[PDB]
Amino acid sequence: AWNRKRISNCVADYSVLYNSASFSTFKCYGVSPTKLNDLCFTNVYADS
Amino acid sequence: YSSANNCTFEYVSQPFLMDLEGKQGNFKNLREFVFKNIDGYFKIYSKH
């Protein structure tokens, strides 16, 4: 019963993910997670 | 309305104020709007 959320018309970042976060596994498919900044998505969902 | 099932965009514009007077009379003001949709992005224009 995961939670589906909506990220719309705002700005994300990647540099605020790993500075002392030290999470278990961070990875991305079809694009390097390092360059999340330059890429530009549309209608980002959030499932947790 | 009844309720809202889902909502891909929500929004509040800039603050401004209203007269809120029921007194009878000729229209002392004027308002114009041009609603339009181009290439998937909504827009609006106005003048007082």
From Swiss-Prot, chain A:
Record-given protein name: Spike protein S1
Subunit structure, interactors included: Binds to host ACE2. RBD also interacts with the N-linked glycan on 'Asn-90' of ACE2. Cleavage of S generates a polybasic C-terminal sequence on S1 that binds to host Neuropilin-1 (NRP1) and Neuropilin-2 (NRP2) receptors. Interacts with host integrin alpha-5/beta-1 (ITGA5:ITGB1) and with ACE2 in complex with integrin alpha-5/beta-1 (ITGA5:ITGB1). May interact via cytoplasmic c-terminus with M protein. May interact (via N-terminus) with host bilirubin and biliverdin, thereby preventing antibody binding to the SARS-CoV-2 spike NTD via an allosteric mechanism.
Species annotation: Severe acute respiratory syndrome coronavirus 2 (2019-nCoV)
Role summary: Attaches the virion to the cell membrane by interacting with host receptor, initiating the infection. The major receptor is host ACE2. When S2/S2' has been cleaved, binding to the receptor triggers direct fusion at the cell membrane. When S2/S2' has not been cleaved, binding to the receptor results in internalization of the virus by endocytosis using host TFRC and GRM2 and leading to fusion of the virion membrane with the host endosomal membrane. Alternatively, may use NRP1/NRP2 and integrin as entry receptors.
Phylogenetic placement of the source organism: Viruses, Riboviria, Orthornavirae, Pisuviricota, Pisoniviricetes
UniProtKB/Swiss-Prot annotation, chain B:
Sugar attachment sites: N6
Region of interest: Disordered: 14-26
Outcome of substituting Q24E: In strain: Omicron/XBB.1.5, Omicron/EG.5.1
Top-rank taxon: Viruses
Record note on quaternary structure: Binds to host ACE2. RBD also interacts with the N-linked glycan on 'Asn-90' of ACE2. Cleavage of S generates a polybasic C-terminal sequence on S1 that binds to host Neuropilin-1 (NRP1) and Neuropilin-2 (NRP2) receptors. Interacts with host integrin alpha-5/beta-1 (ITGA5:ITGB1) and with ACE2 in complex with integrin alpha-5/beta-1 (ITGA5:ITGB1). May interact via cytoplasmic c-terminus with M protein. May interact (via N-terminus) with host bilirubin and biliverdin, thereby preventing antibody binding to the SARS-CoV-2 spike NTD via an allosteric mechanism.
Role this protein plays: Attaches the virion to the cell membrane by interacting with host receptor, initiating the infection. The major receptor is host ACE2. When S2/S2' has been cleaved, binding to the receptor triggers direct fusion at the cell membrane. When S2/S2' has not been cleaved, binding to the receptor results in internalization of the virus by endocytosis using host TFRC and GRM2 and leading to fusion of the virion membrane with the host endosomal membrane. Alternatively, may use NRP1/NRP2 and integrin as entry receptors.
Name assigned to this protein: Spike protein S1
Species, as recorded: Severe acute respiratory syndrome coronavirus 2
Included stretch of the parent chain: 160 to 207 of 1273
